Amino acid sequence: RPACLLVASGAAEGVSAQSFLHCFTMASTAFNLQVATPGGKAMEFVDVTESNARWVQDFRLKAYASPAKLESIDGARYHALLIPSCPGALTDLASSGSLARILQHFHSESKPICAVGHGVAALCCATNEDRSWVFDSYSLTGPSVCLVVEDFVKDSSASEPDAVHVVLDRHLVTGQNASSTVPAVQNLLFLCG
């Protein structure tokens, strides 16, 4: 089993609960999984409901519910990176210089990156020295429905609001929205097979 880095938000209404549930359970079946967030701050679950409540009540009680400090992580230790749909991504992650260094590693070694829905915003942090995005020539999907970054969701793609829409370009896999979480990471799992 290889290792996979699951980065999420620590921010206020940060991470979508169903997206995360699928990322964690699905990726844990194939990887030694490691949750990481800025500052190591515990995640705040949006969209918690009667269907997933038991699971998150159990998750909060598990030893690895505590994230590692994203700033303290060596990107080289992991073969895959997975960002669930995280509404808080745009305060936490889309401005994280730590994530931009880990992403620059992953893109340089062409390692599998998977980002779903709002988590796709987290990819805007990866500015090269020339202030260009490292995912210049890449084609991606993500939410336009919802702000420090507006130009990169604009010019550097979208289908329908709640429909599963997943795009695989080389080694970058993007889900457009929370709904697309399950096929997205299955593509991730396909890349690592």
UniProtKB/Swiss-Prot annotation:
Keyword field: Endosome, Glycoprotein, Secreted, Signal
Top-level taxon of the source organism: Eukaryota
Gene Ontology MF terms in the entry: glyoxalase III activity
Primary subcellular site in the record, as a coarse category: secreted
Signal peptide limits: 1-30
Gene3D superfamilies: 3.40.50.880
InterPro entries listed in its UniProt record: Class_I_gatase-like, Prot/Nucl_acid_deglycase
Compartments reported by the entry: Secreted; Early endosome
Keyword Secreted: yes
Signal keyword on record: yes
Glycosylated sites: N177
CDD domains xref list: GATase1_Hsp31_like (cd03141)
GO process annotations (BP): methylglyoxal catabolic process to D-lactate via S-lactoyl-glutathione
One GO cellular component term: early endosome
Oligomeric form and interacting partners: Homotetramer. Component of the FERRY complex composed of five subunits, TBCK, PPP1R21, FERRY3, CRYZL1 and GATD1 with a ratio of 1:2:1:2:4, respectively.
Family that this chain belongs to: Belongs to the peptidase C56 family.
Role according to the record: Component of the FERRY complex (Five-subunit Endosomal Rab5 and RNA/ribosome intermediary). The FERRY complex directly interacts with mRNAs and RAB5A, and functions as a RAB5A effector involved in the localization and the distribution of specific mRNAs most likely by mediating their endosomal transport. The complex recruits mRNAs and ribosomes to early endosomes through direct mRNA-interaction.
Protein's name in the database: Glutamine amidotransferase-like class 1 domain-containing protein 1
